[PDB]
């Protein structure tokens, strides 16, 4: 039906929380009121002592990602099952063209894989893995016709996706022109390449070689450069998987001066540290490898959450990019061949809850901002997503702030046989998830429908562009020309 009535709980939006019953009809919220009588035949859910949160939005997923002939184990079906079991009802995945491949053809491939499989709504960012006139031209079609308002370039990955300062400059101008946000994987690629060469030459072949090849100052430098270029163009920039203190500090520094930069920590960075790469077990060590690496500095995750609470970091993704032991073992004598990526789609919200709320770092409202509402505004799908209000989509999570769980591979819903949050006790979990007025997770069991989810288009010139027309006006250099 997509029709359900949720009674006796507390609604929590990012502006306030309050006691109210919520009615969803034909997948849309119809009524919010202190007491809604159940009519004949309507399904009723009890949220006594529980919270109604807008469904989580995961801004950073890589389901079913092709890599070196193999593929990520978590795909669009299993992946979205895991999402809703953890309170996340919307994922944004990355289209990743091969070099010289058309973005439209790559986009077509991605949307076909998803449309068939998704158990919840989704949308897509497009990575700019190579640059040319035709690429520039296909960006316009994506934005105008294919519901895209976000593009991603890489400062890392020399000899493949890496772009230069001159290219990045022009990519950002094109983003500006089309009203798209510009995303950046920000590490100094030339130095990551020299550091990989150095570590392997020293015989440091294990996963720990990964962190040592790329310390956090290379992430902070590249973050700095990408913001300086973006501020010159005068267009919104978005730093994906901000993993380090240094890079977080850079973002805070520039934001303070009024620069239009957004930042995205991820569940791994908020939940674990990089000392697992020094584990004597190779399998365990290699399982935590991703890029940028999870940082071994112990104060890292707390500081990332501090910035998150302040709004100097905006929203939490996962970078969900999962590979099995056998796939990971491709790099057993060479850390550079370990497929990069960890899990998080299922556990993001409970990890954010445990490390943010239960530490006193985040209030309930700041948790909703950090996990749905701000993402929605940034990618221009608010208030359809990320808000419990009349007219908005009936995607809702019944959250129990008092139920405990220890996270383990033995009980997760990922297709991969390892979890980086193994043994971590959390208090506060999703006990029922509702997508389009339908229960898809409840009583510790999934009731998904494969291919239920829909693609959601994202118009250009959203909130991230508010103020920029005026900024362009006041920064006009003709205002500063001397008439001689």
Q: Which of residues 145-164 bind its own copies (CB under 8 A)?
A: 164
Residues 6+ apart with CB under 8 A from 345: 58, 61, 74, 79, 82, 83, 86, 88, 91, 318, 320, 414
Q: What is the Cβ-side half-sphere exposure of residue 352, based on CA atoms within 13 angstroms?
A: 35
Q: Is residue 230 part of the contact set for its own copies (CB under 8 A)?
A: no
Q: Tell whether 241 is in a known binding site.
A: yes
Q: Is residue 425 part of the contact set for its own copies (CB under 8 A)?
A: no
Site for its own copies in 278-337 (CB under 8 A): 278-280, 282, 285, 299, 306-307, 309-311
- Residue count, binding to Zn ion (CB under 5 A): 2
Question: Which CB, 312 or 319, lies closer to Zn ion?
Answer: 319
Q: Is residue 456 part of the contact set for its own copies (CB under 8 A)?
A: no
Site for its own copies in 78-97 (CB under 8 A): none
Residue 237's DSSP bridge partners are 182, 261
Closest CA to 268 of 245, 286, 242: 242
Among 75, 138, 231, 346, binds its own copies (CB under 8 A): 231
Among 46, 105, 108, 190, binds its own copies (CB under 8 A): 190
Which one of Zn ion, its own copies, none interacts with residue 143, CB within 5 to 8 A by kind?
none
Which one of its own copies, Zn ion, none interacts with residue 319, CB within 5 to 8 A by kind?
Zn ion
Distance CA 114, CA 450 (A): 10
CB 2 within 8 A of CB 26: yes
Q: Is residue 191 part of the contact set for its own copies (CB under 8 A)?
A: yes
Site for Zn ion in 398-427 (CB under 5 A): none
Among 1, 46, 144, 202, binds its own copies (CB under 8 A): 202
Q: Tell whether 340 is in a known binding site.
A: yes
Site for its own copies in 365-424 (CB under 8 A): 365, 373, 377, 382-383, 390
Among 364, 418, 421, 441, binds its own copies (CB under 8 A): 364
Q: Tell whether 149 is in a known binding site.
A: no
Closest CA to 97 of 112, 109, 114: 109
Which one of Zn ion, its own copies, none interacts with residue 149, CB within 5 to 8 A by kind?
none
Q: Is residue 152 part of the contact set for Zn ion (CB under 5 A)?
A: no
Rounded CA Rg of the chain: 22
Q: Is residue 319 part of the contact set for Zn ion (CB under 5 A)?
A: yes
Q: Is 422 exposed, middle or buried (0-12, 13-18, 19+ CB in 10 A)?
A: middle
Per-residue binding string, Zn ion, 168-207, x by CB under 5 A, is -----------------x----------------------
- Residue count, binding to its own copies (CB under 8 A): 79
Q: Tell whether 152 is in a known binding site.
A: yes
Among 99, 256, 425, 445, binds its own copies (CB under 8 A): 256
Report the interface residues with Zn ion, using CB under 5 A. Answer: 185, 319
């Amino acid at each position: 039906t997509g029709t359900i009535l949720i009674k006796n709980g507390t609604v929590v939006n990012d502006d306030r929380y309050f006691k109210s019953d919520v009615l969803v009809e034909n997948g849309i919220i119809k009524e919010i009121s202190k007491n809604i009588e159940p009519k004949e035949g309507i399904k009723v859910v009890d949220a006594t002592d529980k919270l109604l949160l807008p469904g989580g939005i995961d801004t950073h997923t890589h389901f079913q990602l092709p890599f070196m002939g193999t593929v990520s184990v978590d795909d669009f079906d299993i992946g979205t099952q895991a999402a809703v079991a953890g309170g996340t009802t919307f994922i944004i995945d990355f289209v990743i063209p091969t070099r010289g491949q058309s973005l439209l053809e790559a986009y077509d491939q991605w949307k076909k894989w998803a449309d068939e499989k998704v158990n919840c709504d989704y949308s897509l960012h497009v990575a700019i893995t190579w640059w040319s006139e035709q690429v520039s031209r296909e960006m316009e079609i994506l934005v105008k016709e294919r519901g895209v308002n976000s593009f991603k370039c890489f400062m890392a990955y020399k000899n493949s996706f890496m772009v230069t300062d001159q290219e990045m400059y022009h990519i950002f101008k094109r983003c500006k022109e089309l009203g798209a946000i510009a995303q950046v994987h920000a590490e100094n690629g030339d130095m990551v390449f020299e550091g990989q060469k150095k570590m392997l030459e020293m015989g440091i072949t294990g996963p720990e070689g990964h962190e040592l090849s790329r310390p956090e100052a290379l992430e902070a430098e590249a973050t700095n450069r990408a913001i300086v270029i973006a501020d010159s163009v005068c267009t919104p920039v978005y730093i994906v998987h901000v993993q380090s203190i240094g890079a977080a500090d850079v973002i805070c520094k520039h934001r303070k001066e009024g620069v239009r930069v957004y930042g995205e920590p991820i569940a791994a960075g908020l939940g674990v540290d990089g000392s697992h790469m020094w584990n004597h077990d190779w399998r365990h060590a290699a399982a935590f490898v991703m890029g940028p690496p999870i940082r071994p500095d112990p104060r890292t995750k707390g500081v990332l959450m501090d910035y998150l609470a302040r709004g100097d970091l905006d929203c939490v993704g996962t970078d969900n990019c999962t590979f099995c032991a056998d796939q990971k073992a491709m790099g057993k004598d060479d850390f550079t061949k370990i497929p990069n990526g960890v899990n998080g789609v299922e556990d993001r919200m409970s990890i954010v809850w445990e490390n943010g709320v239960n530490t006193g770092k985040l209030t309930w409202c700041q948790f909703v901002r950090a996990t749905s509402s701000e993402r929605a505004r940034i990618f221009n799908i608010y208030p359809r997503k990320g808000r419990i209000d009349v007219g908005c989509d009936g995607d809702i999570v019944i959250w129990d702030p008092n139920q405990s769980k220890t996270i383990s591979k033995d009980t997760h819903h990922h297709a991969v046989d390892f979890n980086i949050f193994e043994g971590i006790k959390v208090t506060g979990i999703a006990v029922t998830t509702i997508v389009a007025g339908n229960i898809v997770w409840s009583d510790n069991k999934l009731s998904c429908v494969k291919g239920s989810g829909r693609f959601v288009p994202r118009p250009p010139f959203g909130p991230v562009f508010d103020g920029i027309e005026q900024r362009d006006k006041v920064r006009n250099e003709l205002l500063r020309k001397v008439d001689r």
